[PDB]
């Protein structure tokens, strides 16, 4: 039961389901202490059973319990765990992650197969902890906290921060992801090339694997952090290392529309 | 009484409790029929149940009565002014002891919490809870700056004497977690209250000199 930025209170449906069970339980105790007739006691016990049922699995038996003033059923314990919006599929089998970005993709014809074009402003946020360490290592900032204040305001960013960023990413790779990820080639590791602009440059030969075109598509960006994650991405997930199809064994990074036409 | 926060069966059971109370107090000598006297207790039990169980955040019965009266007054004024009354009109109609500020505070008191699972958008895949940040747990950035400051303060306290560092760490709660006092600090060391104050002040002056000559600790403030 949390207080929102505007001072209003937001609460979960479980509190309402718990209150109903507690209210009915307390009332039954009072009725039993009063020696109420069996008809009243039977109604209270039947309501107590239904209140427990709604708490555990709302709507499974009978009409769903709704919050007065609306017809939206209250979300019970079973609803929390089940379904496409439940705990399993929404929070355990997949998650939202840090060190991730997104932008529109354009074609980079000058790139090598293992390279991508990463915008500088995306890379600045994606590699921020590494950049702060490099800023402190150099004389750009006195400490990590001073360096972080420098990056907060756009007009406070100096031209040596971009030189430091170029050093941070040297040799590292990033993961480029396009939805839907139909097969494992929907994620590939590239060595970023910091570029001016706001769109990600994608190598032409990997568009078929991503099923990507340049009509407005977008991709996500992920930064593996440890040495193990960087080693796996550079060895196993690098685009230049996955040239054949895992499904049929035929080339999957190969000449395409304009390349075929010219040759 | 349906549609006021309690379900139909909940109203019946609360009413049944008033009916049980009515049988206890009903007096047949008066020659009044049972329903005339029982209807008072049945209604009273139902109404008290609504005042006590209709809201997630319970508002006392007296405050519930004030809220109901304020709603009635606004509704009557609204149908007479041909518009929504302002707090000044409502306060004037409520009577003595009421002003626009009190009318507004009472209305702020009577705001029910919103559900964290209310859908947003035509397709039900987004909810209010998905947009509310958690501001209790420290963030990774906040945790690191706290640990960085502790490391720097530890190094700065190294330049102090063996006992001067203990005095500052004891007085500022850097050891046991809670601040100690001059007398309590003296109890550990066996010195009088006045001397502890001076030695701590000299150490604090020492640290100030070190910080000025390094300026390695001002950024954390």
């Amino acid at each position: 039961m949390v207080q929102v930025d505007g001072g209003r209170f937001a609460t979960s449906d479980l509190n309402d389901l718990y209150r109903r069970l507690i209210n009915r339980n307390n009332r039954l105790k009072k009725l039993l202490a009063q020696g109420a007739p069996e008809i009243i006691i039977r109604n209270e016990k039947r309501m107590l059973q239904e209140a427990v049922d709604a708490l555990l699995d709302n709507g499974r038996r009978g009409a769903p319990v709704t919050n007065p003033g609306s017809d939206r059923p209250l979300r019970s314990l079973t609803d929390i765990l089940s379904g496409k919006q439940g705990r399993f599929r929404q929070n355990l089998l997949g998650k939202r992650v840090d060190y991730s970005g997104r932008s529109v993709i354009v074609v980079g014809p000058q790139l090598k197969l293992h390279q991508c074009g990463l915008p500088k402003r995306m890379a600045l946020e994606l590699f921020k902890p590494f950049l702060l360490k490099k800023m402190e290592e150099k004389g750009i900032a006195p400490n990590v906290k001073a360096a972080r204040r420098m990056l907060e305001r756009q007009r406070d960013i100096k031209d040596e921060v971009w030189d430091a960023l170029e050093e941070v990413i040297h040799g590292k790779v990033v993961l480029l992801n396009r939805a839907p990820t139909l097969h494992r080639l929907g994620i590939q590791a590239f060595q970023p090339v910091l570029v001016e602009g706001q769109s990600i440059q994608l190598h032409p030969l990997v568009c078929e694997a991503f099923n990507a075109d340049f009509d407005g598509d977008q991709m996500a960006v992920h930064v593996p952090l440890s040495s193990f994650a960087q080693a796996e991405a550079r060895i196993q997930m690098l685009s230049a290392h996955n040239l054949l199809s895992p499904a049929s064994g035929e080339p999957l990074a190969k000449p395409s529309r304009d390349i075929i036409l010219g040759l | 009484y349906t549609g006021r926060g309690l379900s139909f069966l909940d109203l019946i059971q609360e009413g049944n409790q008033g009916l049980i109370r009515a049988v206890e107090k009903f007096e047949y000598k008066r020659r009044f029929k049972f329903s005339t006297y029982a209807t008072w207790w049945i209604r009273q039990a139902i109404n008290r149940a609504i005042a006590d169980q209709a809201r997630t955040i319970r508002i006392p019965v007296h405050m519930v009565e004030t809220i109901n009266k304020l709603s009635r007054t606004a509704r009557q004024l609204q149908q007479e002014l041909g518009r929504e009354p302002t707090y000044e009109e409502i306060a004037e109609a409520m009577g003595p002891g009421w002003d626009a500020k009190r009318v507004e505070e009472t209305l702020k008191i009577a705001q029910e919490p919103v559900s964290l699972e209310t859908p947003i958008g035509d397709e039900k895949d987004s909810f209010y809870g998905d947009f509310i940040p958690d501001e209790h747990l420290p963030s990774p950035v906040d945790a690191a700056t706290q640990s960085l400051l502790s490391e720097e303060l530890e190094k700065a306290l190294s330049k102090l004497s063996e006992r001067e560092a203990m005095v500052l760490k004891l007085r500022k709660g850097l050891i046991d977690g809670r601040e100690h006092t001059l007398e309590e600090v003296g109890a550990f060391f066996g010195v009088t209250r006045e001397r502890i104050r001076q030695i701590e002040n000299k150490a604090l002056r020492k640290l100030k000199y070190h910080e000025s000559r390094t300026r390695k600790l001002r950024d954390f403030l």
Binding site: R42, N43 | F8
Partner: peptide
């Protein structure tokens, strides 16, 4: 009605 708590209660009090 077995499915409807209200109908079941009304039937019982009508006895």
């Amino acid at each position: 009605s077995t499915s409807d708590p209200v109908r079941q209660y009304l039937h019982e009090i009508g006895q």
